[PDB]
Amino acid sequence: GIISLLDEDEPQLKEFALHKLNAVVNDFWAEISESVDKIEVLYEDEGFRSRQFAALVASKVFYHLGAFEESLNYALGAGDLFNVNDNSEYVETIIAKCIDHYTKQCVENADLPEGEKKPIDQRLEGIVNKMFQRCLDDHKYKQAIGIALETRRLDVFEKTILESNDVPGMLAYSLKLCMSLMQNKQFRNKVLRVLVKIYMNLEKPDFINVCQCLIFLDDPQAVSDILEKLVKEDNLLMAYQICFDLYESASQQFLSSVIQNLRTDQTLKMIKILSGEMAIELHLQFLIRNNNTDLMILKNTKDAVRNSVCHTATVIANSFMHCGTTSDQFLRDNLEWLARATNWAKFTATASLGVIHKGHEKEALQLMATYLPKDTSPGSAYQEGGGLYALGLIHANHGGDIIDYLLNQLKNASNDIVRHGGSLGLGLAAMGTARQDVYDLLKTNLYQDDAVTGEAAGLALGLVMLGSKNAQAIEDMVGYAQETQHEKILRGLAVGIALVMYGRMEEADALIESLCRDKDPILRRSGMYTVAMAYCGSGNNKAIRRLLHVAVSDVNDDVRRAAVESLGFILFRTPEQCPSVVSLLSESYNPHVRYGAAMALGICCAGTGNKEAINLLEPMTNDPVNYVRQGALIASALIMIQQTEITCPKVNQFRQLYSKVINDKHDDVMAKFGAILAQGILDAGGHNVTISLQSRTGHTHMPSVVGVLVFTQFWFWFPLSHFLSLAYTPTCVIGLNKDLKMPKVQYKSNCKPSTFAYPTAKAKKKEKNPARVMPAQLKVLTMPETCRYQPFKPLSIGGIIILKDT
Amino acid sequence: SKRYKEAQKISDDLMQKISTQNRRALDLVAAKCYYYHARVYEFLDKLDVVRSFLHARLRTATLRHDADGQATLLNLLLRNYLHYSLYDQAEKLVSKSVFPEQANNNEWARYLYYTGRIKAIQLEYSEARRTMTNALRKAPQHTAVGFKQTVHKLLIVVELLLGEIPDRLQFRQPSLKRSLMPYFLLTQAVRTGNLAKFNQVLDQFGEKFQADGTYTLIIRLRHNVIKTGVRMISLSYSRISLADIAQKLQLDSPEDAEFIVAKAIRDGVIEASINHEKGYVQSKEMIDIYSTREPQLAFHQRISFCLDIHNMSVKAMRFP
Amino acid sequence: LEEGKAGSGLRQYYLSKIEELQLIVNDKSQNLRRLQAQRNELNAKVRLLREELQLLQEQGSYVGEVVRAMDKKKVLVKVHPEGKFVVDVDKNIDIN
Amino acid sequence: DLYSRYKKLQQELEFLEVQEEYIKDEQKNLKKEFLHAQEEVKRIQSIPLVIGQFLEAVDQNTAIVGSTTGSNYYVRILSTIDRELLKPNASVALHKHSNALVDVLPPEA
Amino acid sequence: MSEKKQPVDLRAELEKHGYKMETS
Amino acid sequence: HGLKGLNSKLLDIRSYLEKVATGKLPINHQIIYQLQDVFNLLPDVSLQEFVKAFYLKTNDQMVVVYLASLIRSVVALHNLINNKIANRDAEKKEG
């Protein structure tokens, strides 16, 4: 009990008291406990010059007593004599408490955002940058960028990116670390916007960082600013990369914004690159030259001739594998099967005509003249409705006057049979374009008061308004749902008001609360697709609060199924955890939860080669219920996409299991529908193309997610199986040097030919028709060393890239 | 080997990173040779230089590796700090924490014997009898050898200070018997209300009292003899004169006769009423109450919190 | 860096200690998933109970004795309280 | 990067945390639904139930029984009681409609 | 264990009751 | 039943005073005087026998809560012992 010396007046006994403290306090760490109140006499006295060290020893006894934030308060009142001396371990704890409290205080002041901010002591932030000198002097960028992410402030972080040496490109993948652990978009884009500016101030320009902000910051004026600087810079060759990343990985309105401010040689170039016509022609040539298909399986499914559910089966399966070939022999090889078609069968029959003709924007209209939507009036009229549906599947995303060609035919001929696939063609072609008149003429078209056309105008109005988050559109869609007696207009408007909101995160939760709280099961399922598309790409637990809650306590299995399917939409960025959390959830008593969860694991891990999802899907195809085996067949084809036998051993085991159950009449027709469907999935695009929901740049692909989420339930609407063609994206290595000119280039790949088998020294590839490639084989390949044409940009992924003449 | 273990201690302060899954075995092995620190240092004198060194190791394990580390180091602290003054009674106050989880097994029971003597130095007999009983009852399986008999020895010390103790001659082992042989007649003198029987035990067995280390309570137990002596006779006798009871209460004058019973009610002993003239102590009793509320309402939280822990065990043991 | 990369050891440790916590709590859900699926399959058992309790009335059930089998795949069997029948396969167990 | 991924590691942590409270409330409501299913199987069935003349248990979960009208049957037995009280020879009360194997007599009056 | 702590170290009455009578 | 009983008599007593304030004749008193006195029949508080009912009711809760502690001991005994048995056995045999 040395603290009893403080009762005497003169301070020299206090300095001698703390001189006793700092030495023998090892055994006295607990002795000062009860007398800390007497230490407060020194801590509260300003005329005592050693009150600093009094707060040091008071912070030591509080360090032994377990007090942390209190030790931080006395660390602030401990003056200069505190921060100077660090020995034993007093440091890691107090700097953990200091940095923690500091970064959560900065986060506290960052939500204000401005004004009224709490006072920040200069000493606690003093030991921030002062102890950060350890990170600056030791030249450790990993920890330096770590604390730079903690402080949540742009000034000291601007000093971290300004540190010496290099760090040549390290800000790029550091933002990959940021966006991976990023919470909200508030300060994210604010930190991102200055990093592309410091890359413009850097001596070596790099377009992958401005590519990262183009797909992350996503603001309309910035792309017009950077490209106006490209035209001002007179950039041609190396801007080819970022320009195609703008077309590929950015929204349509983003393209409409950059072309709007730009147009106010290269003038025709920006038209060619933003329209993406050259990408369609090279994709067409890639699909016709490199097509690998097997007709034997199509014949074994042909001669089955089962009268139930097989109508859409074979045509949608071979329309997948053959997509974009334009060479179709199908109506020639199978005939009596197509003569069996009736009712919606001829819809899907002529709808596949557009799935296999996907792309080929020019001749797609006149080449179908034989299969054109007649309208010869021995009424098949679902026929002539599906013909315009086929023209809508090709004209999705960008388009042309064919959109008005379908619009006039919507105002002509009959009703409502034209609106079924016709308005779907009108809305799908205007998807993401924020078309105006379509919202009006679809309101007077919505008032024609029929049922099957309900899903027609609902999906159309939801596609044209995608990303617009409008007001009167959802107001009129929710206002028409009362007086109508149809449940298909409820489901079409369900996905309609779900599709209008995409990537809204918490902005849509105001409406999500009303949709989920309502007692209408169809409107609850509407809020499930709405909260899915709004939270797509984010793993935030605010969605899983109500999304998973209605997945628990609800009494309707269908909306519960759509609730557990959203795990594939929102969590697709982190597919690995889904098999673990949904493990038991596929053991549930009702097949609906086992089904939607099987679809969740299928679409989430589809872009990955994870064997765990295939392990959990093994008992799913063994379940006694039919459609849960069916969804197990479709999802198992989604996990194996483009993946051959060398990837997972279950490829051929499931391939033979598909033809087995469809050639076996004893099995259910429902469950066997997903078999031939799985043959279309796995073989889609002649194995050359697949579905990709996540681009390498880090931005989600809107038409693929929109394609698969409308493809979720094919039972209610059979033509929804055709919408999955939009989810198909080409995977290829394009050796185009520039413009129209096509160089001849072959480069080497280090993988064995067993990986190259698509049912060593160097690989043989185009030379751009490009050549197909596996995402796992893109890292092992190397640019040609001795060839005349060598890429200026480092080659990593596939697609179309610059090739420089050397 | 202690210096090699100090190199193990510096590496116990560094790597980590990260999950030094071998530092739990380092907690095990080092706790052993930290007790070999105790033995080797005790070859000459106290280890006090290693008390600041133990506090250096015990505090540097905070908060990371304290798990199973802090428990053994706290016993290493408490054992010899119980042998050498001072302040450990108030030191373990601010040290806790608890410190959870209790590891390994009997380690927490023997800790509750060590701190049991500690919490017995505050003399509160409900917490002392529960920490001493829980110290012995929680320790399987032995052998060896006699210190598990020592916790039982000092266990009923606080029960002697309670005023009521059973005769323990039926609990004698072949070893513990020969060790406590003086303590036998001690607790036999505690059962009896005779003063000379207890004082002669003190004078004769004072040598064994030096061997055990418990002394100060032997002289104050005379107050337990006056309170148990008055609890005896009062409830015993119909109406007892203050002159007749003065033999066993050794004074019991006409004045203090009021306070003996009155200040026993302050301690909750006997309800005897006394009208003082000559006088005479007339002891009656009327009580019908209680035996109800706290036992059953606590049994609710007892059973429920138990089965909740048994849930936390079984639910978490299914990893295989 | 001390701010820092050495400080990130403490920062990331908080999310490591909560990782182990959440991992411990994750298993707390995992085994109750086994119990949830247990009684969920038992809910499929009471639905199978009712289904077999729905199956078995509209028909009943009995036990026969085969006195002969047919080339047509039928089988000669008696309904023992009554006159005989002759029925056919019964595709799981074959004639042989 | 270090602080970046450090701010990326609490996303799935909080997502798994809201999944905890979710699946807890999930299996809490489904538990009460299973208790409701227990009220169903205990209500099932009758009251009044025809007792019948039992012969033997052939194999797992099923057995053969004559009714009190004397006809051997093949029925999957009641799930919760397979064996212990069924015995080789007893009189088991058969379902009104189905004649399902449910329970025998005490036995007996 | 052997680990941790332990390795460190009115009569009956016959005569008096019969005498109470003839005493007084 | 409690809260709807609160607002029932509340609004009903609101009509009791409102009918006297407005609507007369009358409604007072065909039944007003007798019905309101029936409300004044029982206030009804102690002393005395109502104090005896108190600790008698306490003596009534004795048995049931005593039985509660009995079920606690039986449920904890069976479940905890049997679960730890099958737990320690499954771990020591598999591990």
The secondary structure of A309-349 as a DSSP string is SHHHHHHHHHHHHTTT-----HHHH--HHHHT--THHHHHH
Mutate which of D11, D20, D96 to test chain C, going by most C C-beta atoms within 10 A?
D20
Question: Phi, psi at residue A799, to the nearest 5°?
Answer: 85, -165
Evaluate whether D74 touches D59 at the Cβ level (below 8 Å): no
Q: How far apart are CA B155 and CA B157, in angstroms?
A: 5
3-state SS assignment for residue B37: helix
Q: Which chains touch A (3 or more CB pairs under 8 A)?
A: B, C, D
Asked if C36 is an interface residue toward chain A (Cβ–Cβ < 8 A), one would say yes
Cβ contacts (< 8 Å) between C37 and chain A: which residues? 584, 587-588
Instruction: Please indicate if any CB of chain B lies within 8 Å of the CB of A64.
Output: yes
Are D and C close enough to touch, i.e. 3+ CB pairs under 8 angstroms?
A: yes
Please judge whether B315 and C24 are an interchain contact, meaning their C-beta atoms are less than 8 angstroms apart: no
Torsion, CA C15, CA C20, CA C23, CA C24, rounded to 10: -140
CB atoms closer than 10 angstroms to residue F40 = 8
Query: Which residues of chain C have a Cβ shorter than 8 Å from any chain B Cβ?
Result: 9, 13, 16, 24, 27-28, 31-32
Angle of helix B66-83 relative to helix B23-42, nearest 10 degrees? 10
CB of A29 within 8 Å of a chain B CB? The answer is yes
Chain F residues with CB inside 8 Å of B306's CB?
Answer: 76, 80
User: CA-nearest residue of chain D to C5?
Assistant: D2
Q: How many of the other CB atoms lie within 10 Å of CB of C82?
A: 9
Q: Which of the other chains make 3 or more beta carbon contacts under 8 angstroms with chain F?
A: B
Q: Which two tokens stand for residue A381?
A: 């009229």
DSSP-assigned beta bridge partners for residue A466: none
- Residues D101 and D62: beta-carbon distance below 8 Å: yes
- Chain-chain contact of D26 with A174 (C-beta, under 8 angstroms): no
Chain F interface, mutation test: which of B307, B308, B319, most F Cβ atoms within 10 Å? B307
**Coil, strand or helix at B274:** strand
From the list A620, A712, A684, the residue with the least C-alpha distance to A657 is: A620
Neighbours of A661 (CB within 10 A): 21
| Whether A391 contacts A362, CB under 8 Å | no
Strand, coil or helix: C68: strand
C-beta atoms of B316 and C32 within 8 A: no
Q: Residue A359: left if φ>0, alpha if ψ -120 to 50, beta else—which one?
A: left
Q: Would you call A174 an interface residue with chain D, using a CB distance cutoff of 8 Å?
A: yes
Tokens matching residue A309: 């559910």
Radius of gyration (Cα) for chain A, nearest Å? 32
DSSP letters, A651-718, are HHHHHHHHHHHHH-TTS-HHHHHHHHHHHHHHTGGGGTEEE-SB-TTS-B-HHHHHHHHHSS--SS-G
Per DSSP, what are the bridge partners of residue C76? Answer: C68, C86
Residues 6+ apart with CB under 8 A from A217: A189, A192, A193
CA-to-CA dists, residue A307 to A22, A295, A314, A669, angstroms: 92, 21, 12, 10
- Nearest chain B residue (CA) to E6: B147
Q: What are phi and psi of A188, to 5 degrees?
A: -60, -65
Is the minimum CB–CB distance between B153 and chain E shorter than 8 Å?
no
Contact A33 B51 (CB under 8 A): no
Q: Give chain A positions within 8 Å (CB) of D33.
A: none
The DSSP result for chain F, as a single string, is: -HHHHHHHHHHHHHHHHHHHHSS-S--SSSSHHHHHHHHTS-----SSHHHHHHHHHHHHHHHHHHHHHHHHHHHHHHHHHHHHHHHHHHHHHH-
Measured between CB atoms, which of A31, A65, A66 is closest to B87?
A31
The answer to whether A349 and A315 have CB atoms below 8 angstroms apart is: yes
Determine how many CB atoms are found less than 10 A away from the CB of residue A208.
17
Structure tokens belonging to residue F71: 């079920």
Count the Cβ atoms, other than its own, within 10 Å of residue A664: 10
First-last CA distance in chain D: 82
Structure tokens at B151: 């916790």
Tell me which chain B residues have a C-beta less than 8 angstroms from the C-beta of C27: 315-316, 318-319
Q: Are A461 and A444 in contact (CB under 8 A)?
A: no
Chain C residues touching B24 at Cβ < 8 A: none
* Three-state DSSP class for residue B165: coil
Please, which contacts does A664-671 make with residues 24 or more away whose CB atoms are closer than 8 Å?
A665/A306, A668/A626, A669/A306, A669/A308, A669/A309, A669/A310, A670/A309, A670/A626, A670/A627, A670/A630, A671/A626, A671/A627, A671/A629, A671/A630, A671/A633
Identify the CA nearest to A724 among candidates A404, A396, A388, A448.
A396
Is residue A799 helix, strand or coil? strand
CA-closest candidate to residue A723, choices A731, A714, A715? A714
What is the rounded CA–CA span in Å between residue A338 and residue A261? 51
Name beta bridge partners: D83.
none
CA–chain centroid gap for A489, Å, is 29
Inter-CA distances, B235 with A52, A452, A570, C68, Å: 65, 97, 79, 98
Task: Flag if E5 and B144 touch (Cβ within 8 Å).
Answer: no
Cis? peptide before D48, omega within 30° of 0:
yes
Asked if the C-beta of E14 comes within 8 angstroms of chain B's C-beta atoms, the answer is no
Please, which residues bridge with residue D101 across strands?
D77, D94
Q: What resolution does the deposited structure have, in angstroms?
A: 7.0
Is residue D42 less than 8 Å (CB to CB) from chain C?
no
**C92 interfaces chain D, CB cutoff of 8 Å:** no
Tell me the three-class secondary structure of A181-219, residue by residue: HCCCCCCHHHHHHHHHHHHHCCCCCCHHHHHHHHCCCCC
User: Which residues 6+ apart lie within 8 Å of A474 measured at CB?
Assistant: A497, A500, A511
Q: How far apart are CA A544 and CA D14, in angstroms?
A: 10
Q: How far is C11 from chain B (nearest CA, A)?
A: 13
DSSP string, C7-21: HHHHHHHHHHHHHHH
Give the method of determination.
cryo-EM
Of A421, B311, A665, the C-alpha closest to F87 is: B311
Q: Which residues of A729-761 are buried (b: 16+ CB within 10 A; e: fewer)?
A: bbbbbbbbbeeeeeeebebbbebeeebbeeeee
Q: Are A230 and A270 in contact (CB under 8 A)?
A: no
Two tokens, residue A797: 């992924």
Q: Does B52 touch chain A (CB under 8 A)?
A: yes
**Sequence-distant (≥ 6) Cβ neighbours of residue A95 within 8 angstroms:** A127, A131, C2, C3, C7, C10
Answer whether A782's CB lies under 8 Å from A747's CB.
yes
A546 closest CA partner among A535, A537, C41: A535
CA-nearest of B117, B59, B110 to B88 is: B117
Strand blocks (E) in chain B: 239-241, 273-275, 280-282
Cβ–Cβ under 8 Å, residues A705 and A772: no
3-state secondary structure of B190: helix
CA A390 to chain centroid: 27
Report residue C12 as tokens.
């990331």
Nearest by CB to residue D1, choosing from A142, A538, A541, is: A142
Q: What are the angstrom distances between the C-alpha of D92 and each of A61, C49, C63? A: 78, 18, 17
Q: Do B306 and F84 touch (CB under 8 A)?
A: no
Can you tell me the distance from the alpha carbon of A477 to that of A460, in angstroms, rounded to the nearest whole number? 12
Residue A626, class by beta-carbon neighbours within 10 Å (0-12 exposed, 13-18 middle, 19+ buried)? middle
Q: What is the C-alpha to C-alpha distance for residues A577 and A565, in angstroms, rounded to an integer?
A: 15
CA A793 from centre of chain: 25
Closest CA to A683 of A571, A772, A751, A596: A772
Contact yes or no for B316 and C9 at CB 8 A: no
Q: Is D6 on the interface with C (CB under 8 A)?
A: yes
AA identity, residue B272: A
A584 interface with C at CB cutoff 8 Å: yes
CA distance C72 to chain D (A): 26
Degrees to nearest 5, angle at CA B95 with B94 and B101: 130
**CA angle centred on A393, ends A389 and A398, rounded to 5°:** 125
Fill in the amino acid letter for A446: L
CB atoms within 10 A of CB A395: 26
Which structure tokens are listed for A731? 């995977």
Pick from A167, A242, A229: nearest CA to A200: A229
Instruction: Give the nearest partner residue to A145 out of D2, D26, D30, using CB atoms.
Output: D2
Q: Considering Cα of A727, then A728, then A733, then A737, what sign does the dihedral take?
A: negative
User: Chain B residues with CB inside 8 Å of F68's CB?
Assistant: 296, 300
Chain C contact present for D46, CB below 8 A: no
- The Cα B31–Cα B35 span in angstroms is 6
Task: Answer whether C2 sits within 8 Å of A129, measured CB to CB.
Answer: no
Query: Are A597 and C47 contacting, i.e. CB atoms less than 8 angstroms apart?
Result: no
CA-based nearest distance A357→chain D, Å: 42
**Alpha-carbon distance A275 to B89, whole Å?**
82
What b-and-e string marks burial along A514-540, b requiring 16 or more CB atoms within 10 Å of the CB? ebbeeeebbbbbbbbbbbbbbbbbbbb
C-alpha span between A213 and A199 (Å, rounded): 12
Q: Which residues are CB-contacts of A441 (< 8 A; sequence separation ≥ 6)? A: A407, A410, A411
Q: What is the DSSP letter of A276?
A: T
Task: Return the axis-axis angle of helices A626-639 and A669-682, rounded to nearest 10°.
Answer: 10
Instruction: Return d(Cα A75, Cα D23) in angstroms, integer.
Output: 44
The whole-angstrom separation of Cα A423 and Cα A119 is 60
Among chain A residues, CA nearest to C5: A143
Q: Which residues contact D57 (CB under 8 A, 6 or more apart)?
A: D63, D64, D77, D83, D86, D88
What are the φ/ψ torsions at residue D104 (nearest 5 degrees)?
-95, -170
CA–CA–CA angle C54, C59, C60 (5° rounding): 90
